[PDB]
Amino acid sequence: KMCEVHDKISAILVCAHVKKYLATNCLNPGLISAIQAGARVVPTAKTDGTCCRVFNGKIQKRRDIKPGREVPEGWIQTGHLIGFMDLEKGDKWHYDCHVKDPSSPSGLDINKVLCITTNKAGDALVYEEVNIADLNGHTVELMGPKFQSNPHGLKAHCLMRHGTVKLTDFPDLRDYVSPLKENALADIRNWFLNSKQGPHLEGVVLHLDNGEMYKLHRHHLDLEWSAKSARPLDQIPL
Amino acid sequence: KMCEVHDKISAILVCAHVKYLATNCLNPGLISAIQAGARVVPTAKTDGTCCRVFNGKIQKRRDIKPGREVPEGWIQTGSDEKSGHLIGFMDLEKGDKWHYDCHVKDPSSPSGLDINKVLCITTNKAGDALVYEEVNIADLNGHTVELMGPKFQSNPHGLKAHCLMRHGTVKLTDFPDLRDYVPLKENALADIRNWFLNSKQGPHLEGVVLHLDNGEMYKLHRHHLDLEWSAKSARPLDQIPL
Amino acid sequence: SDKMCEVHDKISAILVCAHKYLATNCLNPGLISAIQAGARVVPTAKTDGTCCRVFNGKIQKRRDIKPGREVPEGWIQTGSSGHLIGFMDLEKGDKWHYDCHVKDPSSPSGLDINKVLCITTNKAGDALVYEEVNIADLNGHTVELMGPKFQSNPHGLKAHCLMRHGTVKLTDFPDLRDYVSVDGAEPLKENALADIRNWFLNSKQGPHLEGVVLHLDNGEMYKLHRHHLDLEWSAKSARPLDQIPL
Ligand SMILES: Nc1ncnc2c1ncn2[C@@H]1O[C@H](COP(=O)(O)O)[C@@H](O)[C@H]1O
Ligand SMILES: Nc1ncnc2c1ncn2[C@@H]1O[C@H](COP(=O)(O)O)[C@@H](O)[C@H]1O
Ligand SMILES: Nc1ncnc2c1ncn2[C@@H]1O[C@H](COP(=O)(O)O)[C@@H](O)[C@H]1O
Ligand SMILES: [Mg+2]
Ligand SMILES: [Mg+2]
Ligand SMILES: [Mg+2]
Ligand code: NA
Ligand code: NA
Ligand code: NA
Ligand code: NA
């Protein structure tokens, strides 16, 4: 039901990039046209790690090649060229999300990866060792101690399917389109400051029926992102 | 109804040099104030930089050694005795990037700041938690605030942005009523220390500041009680129980 | 005095570990033997600090003497790699060992040498509490000295304090008797390595602990650090210890 991160994602709100961000109350034109076309908008939680995917039972790391640079052997474009490639020898921390097997020529169980996902109820996250094939064809977020200084306080390197966590009581952006409410920036900012989930998140990525996505980082909202300003993700209420 | 931080604040308990450690003796001024018929409201000490909203602008505190130069617009408000410094306040200087950064950003402003809007952390409607709220700076005019956030003291409170907090906002609960030591109870240093270690609010706070009807205040930092004050040893202020 | 064991030797791993010292799904032979003999197994939280003990009425730090160096004056051997295990009296430079004492600005040492700050279970076994205690109440017992200046305070403790080894009893920790042949019959449960790792990841207490130490009825002890389970230990991956639910 959720989309796949294969190209860059526009911002929910028009934001000027000062080389800081100068956010505005103006929604993305594409998002307005989609909401008026009748697409359902599912707000999901944006995590802070390194973009990956499972492709034919293997983990593939995202790599954006800039103009004129050597395309890595194995790169497969998807959407400043965006694409994915297989892991290299030096990708110690990418392979560390696999479950271990010291009696193997690789030391790894190549068919099992640790993941953080929703438990049987829809109330809390849980670490689970899943078959890597369960994530085939899906984009994931690799997170842990050695990625971004572990701003979520995760206890091990794990993958999280994008769109897993669905945000509760997030501002219904359809109320700012043709408009009942008009302060989309402040309302969203207030949701990240005073909601029960906001403090656990780096931002919000919207998943629509078109396969489109629209994101907002804490930096657009003039907010701080860090392990200090972040509550552990494993303690997030769902 | 809360006091304004204009002069250096005295300690609740007579401290002893070794580092200043609190002992089991209350401040003579606090004894005299409690006997003279004064109310004592324990508030929550937070860790940041002292400021105040004078007129409609934020003012940062600056202390001056009497044998120095007074900056333009500096306004004295008190004077220390131990160090002999001059207490006061200033209008923010160009370089106070993170002081100005507590204002609400404004795409329709020549500087990108709604100079009449600040982000502050205050008590919610019910009074059982703290919320971030964008407010008109005029509502804080005349009051002293503690500016906190990422770039101040290394954000020991785990705040999500630079915000202001009116001094005295967080009224403590179950904090020792320091009239029982002026005597029904004897160990004020043990009970006060036990409160920061084992209360539900202590773990979130840098210390305590008593606000009295006389305008007097008396403070106790964790360092007076021989405790650690750091983000590791502090639970986020925004999830403090009230 | 108290029913918990005294850390005077090295502690073996609950599970047979491989080689980075990672645990496998096989219990220690000594543990299986001890279990089958009918020993009571008490799972207790392992906390990251430094090993000490209250001897006479003084804090003593543990020091392992390598087989190629001299024994310090006042060093007591208590156990046996190739190094001895023993305890010393605190040296004048151990500023942060003495810092778990209650301060006293009127004493020669600046400390109340008869009172130490310790973290223990409160009246009702539902939470941990900091508690000023007469040091003589710990005489003979090994404690875990923890605080800001020990391992960078992965527990987020508001002060250097002592904790009697075995104070925190674990709830819902796998009962390792179901993983051992009972009257020769098949064990009721086969995957200890899996069940344990999921305890540290998804239990209510696991995320607050460095590991687990089983305190058996016969004085033996067995351990598992988060690393044995391929898990991270650090302040960011650890919830404050004083918030651990009991
Ligand atoms: N729920 C989610 N939906 C989409 N992208 C996500 C999600 N959670 C984390 N992300 C990541 O956030 C990135 C977008 O932000 P950025 O890479 O900083 O421009 C994507 O490439 C993803 O790897
Ligand atoms: N609730 C409060 N009441 C009074 N002062 C406070 C409060 N919270 C923080 N402070 C600050 O605490 C400082 C006094 O303690 P110290 O920093 O040890 O001199 C003052 O500069 C105040 O700005
Ligand atoms: N409840 C406990 N029981 C036994 N040892 C403990 C406990 N908590 C912490 N420890 C420490 O764990 C250490 C085990 O060795 P190591 O895991 O190699 O550091 C001992 O030296 C103890 O000081
Ligand atoms: Mg980015
Ligand atoms: Mg100060
Ligand atoms: Mg060891
Ligand atoms: Na990221
Ligand atoms: Na001072
Ligand atoms: Na302060
Ligand atoms: Na200051």
Author numbering:
A (entry chain C): 16 to 34, 47 to 106, 113 to 211, 217 to 276
B (entry chain A): 16 to 33, 47 to 210, 217 to 276
C (entry chain B): 14 to 32, 47 to 107, 111 to 276
The article reads:
In the WT structure, either AMP or ADP was modeled in the active site. In the YspRLIG1K73M structure, ATP was bound in the active site. Both structures were virtually identical; thus, we use the YspRLIG1K73M structure to describe the interactions related to catalysis. We superimposed the active sites of ADP-bound YspRLIG1WT with ATP-bound YspRLIG1K73M. In the ADP-bound YspRLIG1WT structure, the O5-Pα bond is rotated to flip the α-phosphate group toward the Nζ of Lys73. This situates the Nζ of Lys73 ~4Å away from the Pα of the ADP in an apical orientation to the β-phosphate group (Nζ-Pα-O3α angle = 144.4°). We believe this orientation more likely represents the conformation of the α-phosphate group during adenylation. Superposition of the YspRLIG1K73M and T4 Rnl1 active sites suggests that Asp75 (Motif I), Glu174 (Motif III), Glu240 (Motif IV), and Lys253 (Motif V) may be involved in Mg2+ binding. We modeled a Mg2+ ion in the electron density that is between 3.5 to 4 Å from these residues, which is a density that would be consistent with a Mg(H2O)62+ ion; however, we do not see the bound waters. Although YspRLIG1 shares the nucleotidyltransferase (NTase) domain of T4 Rnl1, it is missing the RNA binding domain.
We identified C12orf29 (RLIG1) as an atypical ATP-grasp enzyme. Our biochemical and structural characterizations revealed this enzyme to be a 5’ to 3’ RNA ligase, structurally and functionally similar to phage T4 RNA ligase. Although the 5’ to 3’ RNA ligases contain the ATP-grasp fold, their catalytic mechanism is different from canonical members of this superfamily; they transfer an AMP moiety from ATP to the side-chain amino group of an active-site lysine to form a ligase-(lysyl-N)-AMP intermediate. To gain insight into the reaction mechanism of RLIG1, we solved crystal structures of WT (adenylated) and K73M Yasminevirus sp. GU-2018 (28) RLIG1 (YspRLIG1) in the presence of ATP.
